[PDB]
Symmetry: C2
Subunit: 505 residues, 2 copies
């Protein structure tokens, strides 16, 4: 008898993980069991037994007989298909009155939502010999010492199951439409840093263990990306604060030659002389490279450092990646101005972006609300809003927000597909090249991109920030380049705002 | 590209784990690749391509064909079956000259021995997005931060394991599975004078190379799983009894049974042998002797004695989540049953540590399996393992008296452990035949012979080279012979082959 492992709860007290009593099928086959018995205490008719049990468990008659034919065995089991049986399965089998058949109670870890925030919650595995459960990934692993029992401590997360559903359904949709190699979405409270929802694909099912181990890495904290143009917002912020960005001032668009590489605006030719505000709305690489020059390379590196890049956010997830600011030569510096070369985690991106909606204060993202024992009522840990740094002034944040509004809402916008009928949205898109894992350079192909969007709503005074990213669509890659992650952002954001009771127009 | 992950080595420099180059199958299906080409550069005949590829990747032609038929796709990959392909698979596929088909180089973790010391070495898993490898169990996990080159080459971990001895253990355990199909099974070989783990394996287990069965049992039997050890535990009560003056080998004691707190506790043969000498009682693995010695020594002292032998506390090895076990001492029944290894739970590493005292003048040796952690480029040594005394619970004199009784257990005329003898070598040890606690609910597992059978042996007797401890829990086949022969069919080949390998005179 193990102590009961603590539960994992969402922010509203809904169970995400708990221990339950299930049942294991056992069949006595040795004749000795019926030696001194009135009625047989072993399986006498193997074919009839296999026929009846085949209706309850997920096994074909022939395989049941095969197992029942084990020689020199007193008792036999039926693998995982004979265990984790529900109480209804127990009654169903016991009503048959099959000689030698019985059900033994056994404890299992249950995830009521199945595949749901899987890479965050994780999975606990059971040692058959003792029944001991041990976390192998995510919260189950991180908090294993508290969760393990007396009775184990409960862990309460900031996740809201209602919002989590919107994310799971939207990611399922992106997989069917685009079959990408990697995909994630996260919803964060813009004013507190709480993670309200988080999912990724591909992922696993904690309940059944399907696909567990195929990808150990949690995308939010452990996987790294060349973020692309969502990263332009931090270069814009620096330039605003340094006095280098003036929205009405004209600048030369087109291309720049650097260390042998031809870096141009996404449309090749650029737009000639245009205002910097418009340059940002168009996601101009030349604008960012010029702003970098106006501010200075040394100062820009420090700017990205003050925005938390290249350092872990110090969250409670295990093995959080620090990423790295790519600044070794002018080519890395210049490509870093539009989010290539430099690598980041999604949690760093959320942390940095929060500065624009909190008077310049970055909020440390958090997903653990509480670790507490339900018997003693002792609270071992309580999460809270915490400032990660204040890299910019309130004035600078307001000016950045003005440009984010324009990105989506300008008459010359190239991100109109992120608009949600009845709501005001703002944000920044990214369309990045992806580094080939076996070195060399970038992944080749028709549209080999990591597409993403960092959005918030209602604009100016947001309730939530939604960050979604999709790496390397293997299907409909053209549409993925065209629409980015709009097909995930729109339903996630619209459903979330409604659930949070934000007025529609 | 990721830095190279460090290697895991056995004590002689043989590779147990390393990074290698393997290949991923890629198929171009879009017409565009052949727009300006004399020959096709995309898959033109999907049915034939699927037929020919099915000969290398373990995938049915209809499935390959289905995957090749995906709409709005440029390139097709084939999941796990299309990755980790060998250089030989690569040449075989390339020789087919299939339009649109190519092999991409990729890094994979390679375990040359396959299923071999699996629960000790562990397995590293690969994040396909970046290629980053991360340890998920065992040494791969414990030393992940050293092994990975990103926390630029990673550091190597050298173990005390000897692959030659390990082969003997893997073969013996395979034999026990075939014969008895037990629920759990382990064997460990330790250098009797240094505490170095020379070999270690368990069943069921997994294959680190393929990941087959990985996750079915997270627990390493040596450090994490706990057992009610049975009569192998009698040796520590004997040692305590000897040092306190309670054990006189010539002195007589009355055997049979004892009614403790309502329950009737008797010797394995039910009737006992009546009034007999103590020395003979230990040879017969008498429960009445141990219960009587507990009384002579006193309950408070015995608990303390088990504590000084390291029970109830982690040995402080480098394995993650080492279990402390516990001494069952809440009431007289638990106290008395602990005299013969029930109620009390232990790890096998604790058992090895305690047993080592009898062959090292009373000093327990802390078992160890990590020989060094060092970077092969800089030559920096981060850690170096060594022999360390875990405590000296007994005197040189007491250790010698215990060894005298262990000798008799196996070599006395009236021995019931003759099946553990090895022709040509002098062996000694103690047998165990314990009841096993049911995972859910109370009481012990039911059945005709629901036992955890074990043997803690050493050889050559008195001056042993190695200690071999093996245990088998709940045979599901030949449970009768499991009860009669214990783990003799594992101990004999493991010990005999190990002694020959270590050049011990026969
Ligand atoms: Cl947190
Ligand atoms: Cl060690």
């Amino acid at each position: 008898q193990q102590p009961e492992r603590g539960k994992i709860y969402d922010r509203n007290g809904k169970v995400l993980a708990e221990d339950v009593e299930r049942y294991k099928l056992v069949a006595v086959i040795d004749k000795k069991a019926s030696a001194n018995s009135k009625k047989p205490r072993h399986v006498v008719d193997k074919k009839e037994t296999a026929k009846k049990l085949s209706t309850v468990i997920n096994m074909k008659p022939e395989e049941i007989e095969k197992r029942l034919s084990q020689k020199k065995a007193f008792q036999i089991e039926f693998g995982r298909k004979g265990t984790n049986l529900t109480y209804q399965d127990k009654l169903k089998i016991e009503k048959m009155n099959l000689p030698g058949i019985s059900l033994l109670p056994e404890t299992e870890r249950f995830y009521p939502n199945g595949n749901f925030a899987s890479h965050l919650i994780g999975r606990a595995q059971k040692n058959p010999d003792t029944g001991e459960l041990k976390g192998a990934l995510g919260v189950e692993k991180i908090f294993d010492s508290y969760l393990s029992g007396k009775r184990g401590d409960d862990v309460h997360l900031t996740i809201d199951s209602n919002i989590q559903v919107f994310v799971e359904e939207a990611l399922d949709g992106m997989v069917e439409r685009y079959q990408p190699k990697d995909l994630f979405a996260v919803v964060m409270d813009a004013k507190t840093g709480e993670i309200l929802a988080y999912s990724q694909r591909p992922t696993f099912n904690p309940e059944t263990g399907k696909d567990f181990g195929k990808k150990w890495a949690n995308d939010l904290y452990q996987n790294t990306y060349e973020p692309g143009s969502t990263f332009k917002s931090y270069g814009l912020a620096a330039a605003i604060q340094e006095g280098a960005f003036d929205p009405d001032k004209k600048y030369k668009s087109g291309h720049r030659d650097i260390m042998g590489s031809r870096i141009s605006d996404w449309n090749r030719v650029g737009w000639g002389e245009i205002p910097m505000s418009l340059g940002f709305t168009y996601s101009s690489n030349t604008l960012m490279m010029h702003l970098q020059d106006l501010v200075g390379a040394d100062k820009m590196k420090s700017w990205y450092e003050r925005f938390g890049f290249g350092k872990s956010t110090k969250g409670m997830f295990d093995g959080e990646a620090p990423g790295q600011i790519g600044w070794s030569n002018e080519l890395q510096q210049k490509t870093s101005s539009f989010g290539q070369s430099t690598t980041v985690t999604p949690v760093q991106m959320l942390q940095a972006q929060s500065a624009f909606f909190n008077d310049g204060n970055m909020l440390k993202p958090w997903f653990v609300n509480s670790v507490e024992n339900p018997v003693s009522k002792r609270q071992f840990y309580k999460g809270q809003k915490q400032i990660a740094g204040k890299p910019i002034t309130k004035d600078t944040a307001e000016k950045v927000e003005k440009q984010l509004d324009l990105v989506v809402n300008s008459k010359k916008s190239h991100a109109a597909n992120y608009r949600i009928d009845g709501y005001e949205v703002e944000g920044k898109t990214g369309t990045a090249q992806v580094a080939a894992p076996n070195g060399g350079g970038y992944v080749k192909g028709p549209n080999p991109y990591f597409v993403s969007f960092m959005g918030d709503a209602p604009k100016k005074n947001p309730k939530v920030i939604v960050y979604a990213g999709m790496s390397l669509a293997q299907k409909n890659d053209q549409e993925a380049y065209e629409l980015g992650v709009s097909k995930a952002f729109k339903p996630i954001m619209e459903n979330t705002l409604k659930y949070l009771n934000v007025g529609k127009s």
